[PDB]
Amino acid sequence: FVNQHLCGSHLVEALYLVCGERGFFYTPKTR
């Protein structure tokens, strides 16, 4: 692994996959 650029829906998809079966319980929004 090496650190990478991620924006918007790709940053959400990556955080959801790294957070496994948890992720967000609600619909996602940029913050």
Binding site: N3, G8, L11, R22, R31
Partner: peptide
């Protein structure tokens, strides 16, 4: 907030974990 910390600069798996908890 959180999107800029991976979008305008690179981020890690440990940051992608933190963005699920924040």
């Amino acid at each position: 907030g959180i999107v800029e910390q991976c979008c305008t600069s690179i981020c890690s798996l440990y940051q992608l974990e933190n963005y699920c908890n924040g």
